[PDB]
Write a protein that binds this ligand. Structure first.
Ligand SMILES: C[C@H]1CCCCn2ncc(-c3nc(Nc4ccc(N5CCN(C)CC5)cn4)ncc3F)c21
Length: 290
């Protein structure tokens, strides 16, 4: 239980609980220990075996008393800090293309196992010095939920929420992760958030002003969604060439397929891996200081 870990420093404050960098007192292993404060047992245990090089490995699930502990492999930096440190020059496109490629591999692995992330964002994308990028906070959303406030009452960001979630879809699909990854794709290219909304209706309207207000033509059945309103303002679609300059045509074509309104038209992770944008994909080494 907690005795075998030594708390090094606080990493971050997730929704369910606090995450610490810790040292296994017996094996010297440096891990990320998540303290979740209090069905879910069997759902978390289904993630012990969701192992993939682009998924942060869940090492052990400690269950003692009314406190639940998750032990992950430790990574030193999230994508958010790397984007901030690269804000002046921009992440080089070969590195952007490599991160997107690896995350689509990770997504394709979890969607084939019917596991959704439901909350992709730069803050839970972790990188190392070797050029790898991994998905974190994976599978916990179905185990507890995606609440509005964290345990430290911080607001959950909506910038990467798929429109079907914002429109009240109860049973969304794997396409919600492709949408979030598309928004992260755009943010890495332009060094600015694609849809930085501070409310659910502001997030939805910021999507509408960029991609046009959806209708039955582009999204069959959107007018029947639980939170759709006919009184939605009707904005025209902006051209993608102004959305993410100076991304090349391969990248803009891929991004537009990741940002399709209709979840059934949105490109899958496996299909996106065959997109010509990755014809020249490599694995560069990032410029990190730890
Ligand atoms: C993604 C994090 C965010 C914390 C809450 C969600 N969660 N659950 C586990 C981990 C985790 N985290 C790490 N590494 C790490 C991550 C972030 C940071 N900080 C540095 C200081 N910044 C101000 C914020 C980011 C440091 N280290 N490795 C492995 C992991 F499973 C994380």
């Amino acid at each position: 239980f907690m005795e075998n870990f030594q708390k090094v420093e606080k990493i971050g404050e997730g929704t369910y609980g606090v995450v610490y960098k810790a040292r296994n007192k017996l094996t010297g292993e440096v891990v990320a220990l998540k303290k979740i404060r209090l069905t879910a047992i069997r759902e978390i245990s289904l993630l012990k075996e969701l192992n993939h090089p682009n998924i942060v490995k869940l090492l052990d699930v400690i269950h003692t008393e009314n406190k639940l502990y998750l032990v992950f492999e430790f990574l030193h930096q999230d994508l958010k800090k790397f984007m901030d440190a690269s804000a002046l020059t921009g992440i080089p496109l070969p590195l952007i293309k490599s991160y997107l490629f690896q995350l689509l591999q990770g997504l394709a692995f979890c969607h084939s196992h019917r596991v959704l992330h439901r909350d992709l964002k730069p803050q839970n994308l972790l990188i190392n010095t070797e050029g790898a990028i991994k998905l974190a906070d994976f599978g916990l959303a179905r185990a507890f939920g995606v609440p509005v406030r964290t345990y430290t009452h911080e607001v959950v960001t909506l910038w990467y929420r798929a429109p079907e979630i914002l429109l009240g879809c109860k049973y969304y699909s794997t396409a919600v992760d492709i949408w979030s990854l598309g928004c992260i794709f755009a943010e890495m290219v332009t060094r600015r958030a694609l849809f930085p909304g501070d409310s659910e209706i502001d997030q939805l309207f910021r999507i509408f002003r960029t991609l046009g207000t959806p209708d039955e033509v582009v999204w069959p059945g959107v007018t029947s969604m639980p939170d759709y309103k006919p009184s939605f303002p009707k904005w025209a679609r902006q051209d993608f060439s102004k959305v993410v300059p100076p991304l090349d045509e391969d990248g803009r074509s891929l991004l537009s397929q990741m940002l399709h309104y209709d979840p059934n038209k949105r490109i899958s992770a496996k299909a996106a891996l065959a997109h010509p944008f990755f014809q020249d994909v490599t694995k560069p080494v990032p410029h990190l200081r730890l």
